[PDB]
Amino acid sequence: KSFKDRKMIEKMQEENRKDREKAAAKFREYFPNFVGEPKSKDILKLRLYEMQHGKCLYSGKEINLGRLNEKGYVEIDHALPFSRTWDDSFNNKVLVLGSENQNKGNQTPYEYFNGKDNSREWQEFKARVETSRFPRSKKQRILLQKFDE
Amino acid sequence: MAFKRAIIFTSFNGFEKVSRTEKRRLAKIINARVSIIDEYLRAKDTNASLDGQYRAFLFNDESPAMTEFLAKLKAFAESCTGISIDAWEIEESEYVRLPVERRDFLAAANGKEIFKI
Questions:
Q1: DSSP code of B24?
Q2: Do B101 and A131 touch (CB under 8 A)?
Q3: The dihedral formed by the CA atoms of B89, B90, B95 and B100, expressed in degrees to the nearest 10
Q4: Rg for chain B (alpha carbons), in Å?
Q5: Which of A27, A41, A65, A93 has the smallest number of CB atoms closer than 10 Å to its CB?
Q6: Would you call A45 exposed, middle or buried from its count of C-beta atoms within 10 A (0-12, 13-18, 19+)?
Q7: Can you give the residue ranges of every domain in chain A?
Q8: Buried (b) or exposed (e) across B22-55, using 16+ Cβ within 10 A?
Q9: 10 Å Cβ neighbour count for B99?
Q10: What does the record give as the active site (chain A) (predicted)?
Q11: In whole angstroms, what is the distance from residue A129 CA to residue A144 CA?
C-alpha cells in the first residue's frame, strides 16, 4: 500500500542487488581472464568448491581452483541421478572432477560406492559429505540408501 | 594462479569492554567479502559471531583486494582496544591439502604471519 512500504522495498531491493554484484565482482577477481559474465552455474561451481573444502566429492582429490572454468575439468553432477529423481534442486548438485564423473551413470552415491557392504570408498565419501559445509538436508539427500521402489 | 587465504582470527581482549558500534563495524568489514559464494563466513554484530572465530578469506593475490581487506582490518583493529585481530597468509594449494578438521586452526599455525594487533 503505502509510500513507506515503497521505501522499504527499494531498501530491500538494494541489498539484493549489492549481494549479486558482490558475488559477480568476486568471480572476476578470482578469474580476470574469464571471458564474459559469470552465469548462475559458474557461481554454483565456485560455491560448491568452497562448501566441499576444495575437494572433488567423489575422489577426494584436490581441485585446482585455477582450472575451475576450464571446459572439461570440474563438472556439476546430480548425486541422485536425474533419470530416477528428476531432482535439479541445489541439494542434489555436487562438484566433482570431470575424470571422476565418467563411470557413475545412473547410480546413487550409495550404490556407486558400494555402501551396502560398508566399503572403504563409501566410508571416505560419507565422511567427506558429513564434514562439508552442505546443509543437513543436502547431506541426507546425497547419502540416501533406498528409494521408493 | 596466485590464490591465497587470509586466515583471520578475532578474539576479545577483556582489556576493555567492546561497544555494539565496534561490533557492527567489524561485522561490516567481514561481510564485505561475504556473498552467496561463501555465506558461511557471514558475521553478525554479536559476541558469539566475532569472539574466538577463525575466518579463511579466499583471494587472488594478483589482485589488490587482499591488501585492501587487510588494511581495513588493521585500521579498525587499532581503533578498538576491546578486540584483538590476528592475520596469516597461506597458499590455497597448501590450504586445501590441510585436513578439514581444525583446518583454519592449522592454517594459522602453518601460515605466514601478517599482523597481530
A1: H
A2: yes
A3: -40
A4: 14
A5: A41
A6: buried
A7: 1-149
A8: bbebbbebbeebbbebbeebebeeeeeebeeebb
A9: 10
A10: 78 (proton acceptor for hnh nuclease domain)
A11: 12
